[PDB]
Amino acid sequence: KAVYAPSEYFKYGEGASKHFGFAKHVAIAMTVGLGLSF
Amino acid sequence: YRPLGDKELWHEAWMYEDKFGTEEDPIIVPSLEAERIIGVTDPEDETLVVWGILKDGEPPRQFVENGEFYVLKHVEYIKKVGDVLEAIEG
Amino acid sequence: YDFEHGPHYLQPEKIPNFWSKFYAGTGALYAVGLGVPLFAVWWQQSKLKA
Amino acid sequence: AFMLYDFAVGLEEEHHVTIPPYPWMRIRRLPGMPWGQDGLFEGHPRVATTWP
Amino acid sequence: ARAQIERWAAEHPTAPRVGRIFEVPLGYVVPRVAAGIAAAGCLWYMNNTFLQTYRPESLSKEFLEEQAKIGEVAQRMNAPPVYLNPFTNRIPGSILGPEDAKPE
Amino acid sequence: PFKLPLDAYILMLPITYASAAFVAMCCRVPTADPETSSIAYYEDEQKSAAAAQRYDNSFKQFFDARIRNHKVGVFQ
Amino acid sequence: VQPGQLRVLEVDERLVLPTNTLIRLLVTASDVLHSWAVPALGVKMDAVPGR
Amino acid sequence: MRWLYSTSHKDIGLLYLVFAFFGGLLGTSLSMLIRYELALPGRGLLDGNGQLYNVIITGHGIIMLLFMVMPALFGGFGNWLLPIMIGAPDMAFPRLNNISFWLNPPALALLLLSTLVEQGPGTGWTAYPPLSVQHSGTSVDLAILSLHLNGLSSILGAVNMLVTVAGLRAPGMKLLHMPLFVWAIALTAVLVILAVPVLAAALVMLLTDRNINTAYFCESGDLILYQHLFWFFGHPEVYILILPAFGIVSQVVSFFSQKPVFGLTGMICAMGAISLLGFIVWAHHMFTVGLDLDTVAYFTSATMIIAVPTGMKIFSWMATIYSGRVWFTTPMWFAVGFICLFTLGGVTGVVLANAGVDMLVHDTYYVVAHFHYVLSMGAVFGIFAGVYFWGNLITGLGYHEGRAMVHFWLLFIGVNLTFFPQHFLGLAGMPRRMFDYADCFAGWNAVSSFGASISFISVIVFATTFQEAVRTVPRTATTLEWVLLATPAHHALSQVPVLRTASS
Amino acid sequence: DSPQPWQLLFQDTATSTAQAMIDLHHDIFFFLITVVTLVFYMMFQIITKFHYSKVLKPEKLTHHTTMEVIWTIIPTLIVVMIAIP
Amino acid sequence: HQTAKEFYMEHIGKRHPFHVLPPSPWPMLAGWGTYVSCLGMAAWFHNMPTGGALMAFGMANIAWTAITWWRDCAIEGDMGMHTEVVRKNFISGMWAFIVSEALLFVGLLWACLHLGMSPSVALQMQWPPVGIEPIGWDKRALVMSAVLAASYYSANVAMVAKDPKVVMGALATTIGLGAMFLADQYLEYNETPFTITDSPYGTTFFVTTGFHGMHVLLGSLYLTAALMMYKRTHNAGAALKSSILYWHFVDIVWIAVYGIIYVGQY
Ligand code: HEA
Ligand code: HEA
Ligand SMILES: [Cu+2]
Ligand SMILES: [Mg+2]
């Protein structure tokens, strides 16, 4: 029985970025910025 | 031992060992003191470094996930590989 | 404490009356660093007012 | 060999070419020099005084 | 990456980990920054009140009312007067000055 | 040392453009009008005016057709 | 100053320039560096002794 | 005897940190006289003295530039953290490291002595001739000799740093495994070695013009030559003061996100591109001196390129925070604040790069608001981010988290209300380096002088944050200074650590 | 002509050159507004959505070549769009 | 003391090949010597009495502090504290110092190129100004170039030789050739028909050639100090190599100085 290193990361996609919606938030930010700029 | 070409003669190999440390066969780290800091890279990523501390008289310890196991051993001399054992060339 | 060969080069919990000298030094540092420009203002304006 | 020849043909020749006091000659923004009146290493001043 | 986090959290025990973005409660932060802002305002007021050696005559209320009678109008020594900054005050292009207007 | 990633060459295109423009601007100065150590350069009026107009027109002539059309803004 | 004038900004002798006319302004200085800036006309050029 | 004869890097770095704190106190004191003269129209506490106001702004600018941010980031965190981070037992030249520090108190003493001699050196921190040459007396010579001594200090420190990174790394550790603070300090050293001797030559010419009656910058000389040489020095100088802040922000953001830095090679390449472009854009400070339109054209086009590497660094920091497990602490708020507020300091630099727009806002408070965004909120936030991060390792003292948050919010409010109104003053045409202004500029001047007092209060509150520490035992980390005890030994790394590459 | 109290932007103009300068400034500000909005909104959303009370353990994301190339190539086009006027 | 060497071997020397120094008093004394000499220099600029003596006093103190510092370095070399990697780091530090001195000279020659290329109306747009008789390339300056090239090659001999007599003779020849470059620059400074106060040409000429002559003197003294360490133990190590590197740097600087000032008349 030895000292094991723990699992420290998820793989990108099955943790807490599957529910983020990156492209949706970038589209919202660009929409708000373009509306203010216009 | 890994190929000692393009290795400095004073780098104290054990770091250049040809072994993957397992639970049932760890890599024995020599040390002049009861504790020593060593650095292990991620097996899946050369850019990531995890530094750990090994202690004398302890079980095998793994620093990164899916990495080598290590056991420290207190010695009075560390073989300065490059003129210690390749001058022997046994 | 042994700063050269002990485990720590700076052992602030082992100077006697550490928190008094620390606040005295901090106060003196703030006093000098906030009062040197005012002395320079006073020195130049006291030479014109002659 | 040429430098040893040069060391014997040193301070013997002379120039008497006086120079008029042009605005770019002998600038004296502050009066004099920190070591005296003339420049350093200058034993034979050229710019003219009493400019006719 | 987690072990250095847990080590830093042990050497800094006054930093809380309670599950909110502003870990220190605002009931601690807001009164103290309010007191600091109040002390800064007192220093600013002391500078305004007690540390002036010349107050300009162009800021007296007589000067200000006589200026507000005139408006944003500049005189000329070679021409009639002109309205200053005609685009922001919306003077039309036909009108150049007060005297040249001669209102109907 | 390491392998430069794909960004750094997109970086190196305007960097190489800027370095080349800097070298060109340094080079074309001792081949211009006021860099003459004589008053006798200007007594030849034809060559002096021709050289000075050549120094005028280069890198400006790429902009004359949009100077004349008031292309001085991103929008109009 | 007097009411209708601007403090700090007012001079005794102005500079009179006609409109709709191409004007050449040669800016220089005599002792130290200066700069002739009029933000309404978009002109700001430094006055250098010798230039 | 310990603090006068030191050869250890950890003691010399701590001496730099304390000296930088003293310089920050002196500059903050000099900065309250500026904002208290400028609170109201007319004549304030300086009794209508303009020479004294010029002396005050000159001393304030030189002190806050050279004797605060430079010894804190380069000499302070660099000397303490570089050999531990790479695994070196010491510096390469330990007695040269001590004369690197010990040439700074003579320079600061000469600069402070110049204020008390004759009428002082009222020239600005750029010291343009013939204003520097016209000054009768001795004060300008003392100020320039202070500049020489500080420059020689920085050159010697960069020499030690460059030989240390090149030749004393841990076995198995190449120039790929060093953290980004080491890369930032190394590129800063390269910039220092290349740029400072140009300033030394320019100031030697200034001394000969002042005192030897030479003709470098005079009637028969060329006054644009000084501005050329000075800004060829001075624009790399402002990237010397900002790259260690990038390294610190990378280390801090990586730590509390529980994630490594996004795009490591892109980060190094962006820092290198910033370092290289800083030497060919310098005449963006000289748009109004009367240069030919092709020179102005090139320097306008080249200055806008620096935006792309900086934007990559900012987006890489945001991607580092992205998809992590983030715990917001006091150093974390000083790095999120860095990212959000250095952007406001760079976007106005883009505006200043365009020379047509720069014809209106040259030597106005738009410039001042820009360079107090990138320095009082980029470099100061970087300095204060590392004080609450590495402070228990460096000094041995903990800090109270509540009072540190009070100090952060006070500083954040006091700087967003001091320099944000200085944009509107500069767009409306208020000139720089003036103490009496027009009657219509009063409202934003009053708001800015209100913000400066909040800044001063946050300076006072910072002294109350220190407390006793709790000491624990390390097992594992991602950087080499977080496996050491707090404080480490006088000879930290008793055994030189090695980096073992696995079979992968 | 003359500055006004509580003024934000530039003064009024009497030449076409200065009006061209002001129009160039406002054209640059058009891009700056969108840049600052994108940075600030994305920072707020990244801050709120990745707090440790939401995240059990992080994800391994060191590189993304497409997004790196995208935020390298979009600002360079903005630089060259600004530079020619 | 007898266990100090034992403690060093137990804790530093047998663990890494780098050198750890004991505490030293010379950096602080050198810094405050710079303070005293700067005060003396500022007083000597404006003809304050007893100001030049104060400047000389501060410079003498800096020189003594540096001499004792370098004697300590030589002692530490002779007791075998420096391994091979330490000497490689010494050459690396000399390369960085050479780069800094190179950019100093680049900034100095930038002024020559700027002022010579476009004369101003204050000079009545004539370069060189009327009255100024410039120094020719077809004379004693060519002899200087020949002597300094001979010094380059003789210093290159001592870098590669293995016979100690050859190394000592080559170093002495290099030092004696460097001394003839300075004793003849003194003759140029005495025979020249202009001053540092006469026009930007005289200004740039004297400042740039004086900085080069100061660097020649420093390199000659460094080569002299590297020879006496070899005259004793027939070993110099990094002292020989770094002095040769600095001398070659001075030689390369003279190429730009000659080809910009003497040939280009700038
Ligand atoms: C390092 C850069 C720096 C910093 C931080 C500041 C900080 C401040 N500055 Fe400025 N300033 C300049 C650089 C800086 N400044 C320069 C270069 C000039 C031009 C001079 C010239 O023209 O010659 C100038 C001039 C200048 C002007 C223009 C005056 C004029 O045009 O005549 C004004 C006006 O508002 C001003 C005000 C302030 C205020 C209120 C702060 C506030 O932020 C007050 C400071 C508060 C702080 C919190 C910073 C102190 C930091 C510490 C104490 C941290 C140290 C800690 C450790 C080392 C652990 N300063
Ligand atoms: C901390 C030091 C520092 C830093 C980092 C900078 C960074 C920049 N500076 Fe500045 N500057 C100063 C310190 C600094 N500066 C000082 C002290 C002065 C006055 C000197 C004096 O006279 O006293 C000055 C003055 C100054 C001038 C001269 C104006 C004048 O005096 O008349 C100019 C002109 O080009 C300039 C521009 C820039 C630009 C383009 C950057 C760029 O590096 C900024 C880049 C960052 C960004 C652009 C934001 C991040 C980018 C993105 C988020 C992507 C989106 C961007 C685009 C789409 C374009 N600044
Ligand atoms: Cu700049
Ligand atoms: Mg200016």
Automatic annotation (TrEMBL), chain A:
State the source organism's domain of life: Eukaryota
Per its record, how is this protein called by name?
A: Uncharacterized protein
Q: Which residues of the full protein are shown?
A: 11 to 48 of 96
From TrEMBL, chain E:
Q: Which domain of life is it from?
A: Eukaryota
Q: What is this protein called?
A: Cytochrome c oxidase subunit
UniProtKB/TrEMBL annotation, chain F:
Q: What is this protein called?
A: Uncharacterized protein
Q: Superkingdom, according to UniProt?
A: Eukaryota
Automatic annotation (TrEMBL), chain I:
Q: Where is the Cytochrome oxidase subunit II transmembrane region profile domain?
A: 2-85
Transmembrane segment boundaries: 28-48, 69-85
The entry's family comment says: Belongs to the cytochrome c oxidase subunit 2 family.
* Taxon lineage: Eukaryota, Viridiplantae, Chlorophyta, core chlorophytes, Chlorophyceae
Q: Which domain of life is it from?
A: Eukaryota
Q: Gene name? A: cox2a
The protein here is known as: Cytochrome c oxidase polypeptide II
Annotated organism of origin = Chlamydomonas reinhardtii
**Which compartments is it annotated to reside in?**
Mitochondrion membrane
Instruction: Identify the stretch annotated as signal peptide in this record.
Output: none
